[PDB]
Amino acid sequence: TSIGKIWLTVLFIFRIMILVVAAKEVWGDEQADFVCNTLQPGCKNVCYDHYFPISHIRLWALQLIFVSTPALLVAMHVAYRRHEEGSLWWTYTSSIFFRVIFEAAFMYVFYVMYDGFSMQRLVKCNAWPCPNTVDCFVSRPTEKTVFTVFMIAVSGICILLNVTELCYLLIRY
Amino acid sequence: TLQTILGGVNKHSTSIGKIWLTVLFIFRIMILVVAAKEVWGDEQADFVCNTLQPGCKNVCYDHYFPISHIRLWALQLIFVSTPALLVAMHVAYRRHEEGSLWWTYTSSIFFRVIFEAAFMYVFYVMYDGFSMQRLVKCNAWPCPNTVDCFVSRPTEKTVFTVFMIAVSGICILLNVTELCYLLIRY
C-alpha cells in the first residue's frame, strides 16, 4: 500500500537520522555535568542512578531495533520458503500487529518511568548515603525536552499509520 | 560512493534545480561537518560564570542556549531534503510500474521554501539577531542576584552563523524563481 511502501519507511529513517547525527551528543555529558550541592562522597552516583535508571537515547536505540525485526524476519522467512495466499497474508497482518505492540509499549515506559515528557532543572534526592535531602541539577534540560517531544510525536504518527493499513485490510476481508 | 545516491536525484530535475540547488546543498553539508562542528565542541565546557553557587552554571547555560546552533542546522537540512527523497521514491517506483508530476513537483518546491523561511525566523526570534555576545547576565534561580557568564568563541560562531544564513537566503531566491518559470507556463 502507498502508506506502507513509502510513509512508514520514510519516517523510520527520519527517526534514525535524528538519533545518530543530532541527539547522540546532547546526552554525551549527562553524568559528567550532573552537579549536586553536597560534600558527601558517593551522593552524586546514587542520585544520578536513581533518577535516570536508563538513558533516553538507549531506550530509543532499543525501540528502533524491536520495531525493525518483524520487517527483517518476514523478508528472510519468505525467501527461504520460496528458495525451496493465506500464509503470506497471515504473516503480513501479524507483522504489522507486532509493530503496533512495540511502539505502544515503549511510549508507555517513557511516560511512567520519567513522569511525563518534560525534564526538570532541579531534582531532590534523599537516597543513602546522601544526608537528609540534596539538590542536584540536570545538564541541558531544555534541549533534551525538545528532542523528547519530537521523538514521541513521530512515534505516535507511526502508530496511526499502522492502524489505518490494518483497518484497510480487515474491511477488504 | 554517494555518487550513485545523488545521481538518481540528480535527474528528475529542471534547469537550475539540477545544478544550483543541489550544489548549494552539499555546500551547506560540508560546512556543517567539516568545519562548524569543531567550533561548538566545547560550548559548555568553556562556559565560565563568576560565582561560587553550585548549579548556577547549568541553569545559566541552559537559559541562554535552549538549543544549540548546530542542531538547528542539522534539523533544517533533514527537513528540506525529505521532499526530494519522497519525489525520487514515489515517482520512480511508479515509473517502474504531466499534471500529476507537475502537481507533485510544484508542491515539493513549495514545502522547501516554507521550511527554510520557518527556520530562519526561529534563529532571529530565539537568539535575538545573528551576532553572539561575549557577556551574558543571568538571574535565574539558584543564582544569586545577577551573575556574569562568558561565552566561548563568540567571534568564530558569528562568522559561521552569518555564512549559513546567507546561503539559506540564496536557496530561497533560487526556489522562488523556479516557481515563477513553472507558474508562467501554466
Numbering used by the authors:
A (entry chain A): 18 to 101, 129 to 217
B (entry chain B): 5 to 101, 129 to 217
Show me the paper's own sentences about this structure.
Connexins form large-pore channels that function either as dodecameric gap junctions or hexameric hemichannels to allow the regulated movement of small molecules and ions across cell membranes. The hemichannel is composed of 6 connexin subunits arranged around a central funnel. Each subunit consists of 4 transmembrane helices (TM1–4), an N-terminal helix, which lines the funnel entrance, a cytoplasmic loop, two extracellular loops, and a short C-terminal tail. Here, we use cryoelectron microscopy (cryo-EM) to determine the structure of human Cx26 gap junctions under increasing levels of PCO2.
To examine this more quantitatively, we carried out a further classification without imposing symmetry and with the same numbers of particles from each PCO2 dataset. As the N terminus is located at the interface of two subunits, we created a mask incorporating two subunits and again carried out a process of particle expansion, subtraction, and masked, fixed-angle classification as above, but using four classes (see STAR Methods). From each dataset, 125,000 particles were randomly selected from the final D6 refinement. These were symmetry-expanded in D6, and the same mask was used for particle subtraction and 3D classification, with appropriate changes in pixel and box size for the 55 mmHg data. Red boxes indicate the full, extended N-terminal helix (NT) position, and blue boxes indicate the truncated, raised NT location. The remaining two classes in each data set represent intermediates between these two extreme classes.
